[PDB]
From Swiss-Prot:
Induction: Up-regulated in lung epithelial cells from asthma patients.
Binding site residues for chitin: 49-50, 76-79, 120, 189-192, 339
Protein purpose: Degrades chitin and chitotriose. May participate in the defense against nematodes, fungi and other pathogens. Plays a role in T-helper cell type 2 (Th2) immune response. Contributes to the response to IL-13 and inflammation in response to IL-13. Stimulates chemokine production by pulmonary epithelial cells. Protects lung epithelial cells against apoptosis and promotes phosphorylation of AKT1. Its function in the inflammatory response and in protecting cells against apoptosis is inhibited by allosamidin, suggesting that the function of this protein depends on carbohydrate binding.
Active site per UniProt: 119 (proton donor)
Family of this protein: Belongs to the glycosyl hydrolase 18 family. Chitinase class II subfamily.
Protein name: Acidic mammalian chitinase
Subunit relationships: Interacts with EGFR.
Tissue-specificity statement: Detected in lung epithelial cells from asthma patients (at protein level). Highly expressed in stomach. Detected at lower levels in lung.
Full-protein positions shown: 22 to 398 of 476
S-S bonds: 5-30, 28-373, 286-351
Enzyme class: hydrolase
Residues covered by the GH18 domain: 1-369
């Protein structure tokens, strides 16, 4: 199995114990590390933070401590939108300009591949032709990577993609069988499945449906989403299950109505470290639990929740990560990806469960505890 972990270049700005840099990553924890995010300018890949080059160096330098570790650079993200992707795929000349720039960039900065995070082809402003043009882009990149590998006599750069979990988004976004042929891995974003936008409490990454999930709501779980991708043409072995080390929080409309599907009035408070409205990092959730919140367990969905006063959070813990890991193995998927390494309790000081408790749970369950960890020759 793969254990693929995303690092974010804005974690560096968090106060005190929240500050997370590339050198805070245990090089032995994950099989793959992915750097979020690169941007785009004039159809070429670019940095987005002032110190990205320094951070790339520290990030890829982790490979000097683990000979088997591979790194990728993710381009895009939710906030990036679609406009630059649409313009880039719109002409073969623009795609060539992009692919050329990517080969140069990855080789220059010592990344082992590119993770596409276009959210998403065919939606959020992206026109219908982008569904097919995305397949074309990925194929051209894969083939360019194959050709480059042989011309310079080095291992081939990887091409992967982070992909939608929403059924409507998948249908308008991806030619699954064709896309699957050229991607090395498919990073399925099986989280953000519920949020305050719905006006009631719901889980971030439930494994199964809740009894009340009717109609299209029955699609809002990890099991349905992974199987949808599989049944519609993606090989299980290339499919990578999404694991969140954060939760979504809510303001309860009634403080003593605290179950799944309880009325909410909006997003819950930003955390004191990550400072993200409606989102708490796992370690931020541990503070909530320490401060007296009542622990809940969503039995049908195999995930925890917690509440105190008018604040409710749906999230994942060691227990739920373990349950999902076992399910993943039973279903013979390629492994797990984690958003994000910097949101796990990396210091170990918040949750008292050891350093990186959530990702460590996956490392153990996926048979990677004895994985080789030695500097390269
Ligand atoms: C809100 O202020 C903090 C900080 O936000 C940065 O934006 C990022 C956050 O909103 C991320 N959310 C969480 C819960 O971490 C968000 O994460 C998305 C990501 O875009 C998607 N891509 C993937 N994978 C697997 C490739 O997974 C998804 C995750 C989880 O939903 O990402 C946005 C950025 O897209 C700000 N940064 C940028 C670059 O906009 C900024 O640093 C801000 O201060």
């Amino acid at each position: 199995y793969q254990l693929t972990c995303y690092f974010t270049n804005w974690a560096q700005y968090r106060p005190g114990l929240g500050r997370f840099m590339p050198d805070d990553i245990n090089p032995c924890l994950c099989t793959h590390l992915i750097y979020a995010f690169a941007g785009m300018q004039n159809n070429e890949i670019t940095t987005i933070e002032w110190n990205d080059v320094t951070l790339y160096q520290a990030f890829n330098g982790l490979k000097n401590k683990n000979s088997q570790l591979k790194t990728l650079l993710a381009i895009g993200g939710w906030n990036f939108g679609t406009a630059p992707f649409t313009a880039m795929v719109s002409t073969p000349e623009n795609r060539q300009t992009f692919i050329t720039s990517v080969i140069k960039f990855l080789r220059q900065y010592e990344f082992d591949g590119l993770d596409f995070d276009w959210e998403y082809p065919g939606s959020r402003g992206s026109p219908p032709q982008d569904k097919h043009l995305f397949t074309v882009l990925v194929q051209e990149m894969r083939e360019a990577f194959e050709q480059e590998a042989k011309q310079i006599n080095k291992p081939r750069l990887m091409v992967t993609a982070a992909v939608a979990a929403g059924i409507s988004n998948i249908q308008s976004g991806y030619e699954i069988p064709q896309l699957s042929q050229y991607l090395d891995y498919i990073h399925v974003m099986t989280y953000d499945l519920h949020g305050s936008w719905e006006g009631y409490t719901g889980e971030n990454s439930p494994l199964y449906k809740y009894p009340t999930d009717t109609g299209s709501n029955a699609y809002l779980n990890v099991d349905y989403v992974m199987n949808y991708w599989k049944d519609n043409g993606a090989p299980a072995e290339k499919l990578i299950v999404g694991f969140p080390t954060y939760g979504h929080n809510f303001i309860l409309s009634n403080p003593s109505n605290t179950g799944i599907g309880a009325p909410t009035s909006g997003a819950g408070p930003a955390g004191p470290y990550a400072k993200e409205s409606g989102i708490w990092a796992y370690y931020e959730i541990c503070t909530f639990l320490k401060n007296g919140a009542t622990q809940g367990w969503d039995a049908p969905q195999e995930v925890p929740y917690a509440y105190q006063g008018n604040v409710w959070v749906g999230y994942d813990n060691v227990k739920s990560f373990d349950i999902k890991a076992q399910w993943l193995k039973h279903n013979k998927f390629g492994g797990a990806m984690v958003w994000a390494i910097d949101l796990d309790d990396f210091t170990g000081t918040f949750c008292n469960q050891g350093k990186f408790p959530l990702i460590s749970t996956l490392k153990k369950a996926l048979g990677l505890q004895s994985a080789s960890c030695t500097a390269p020759a």
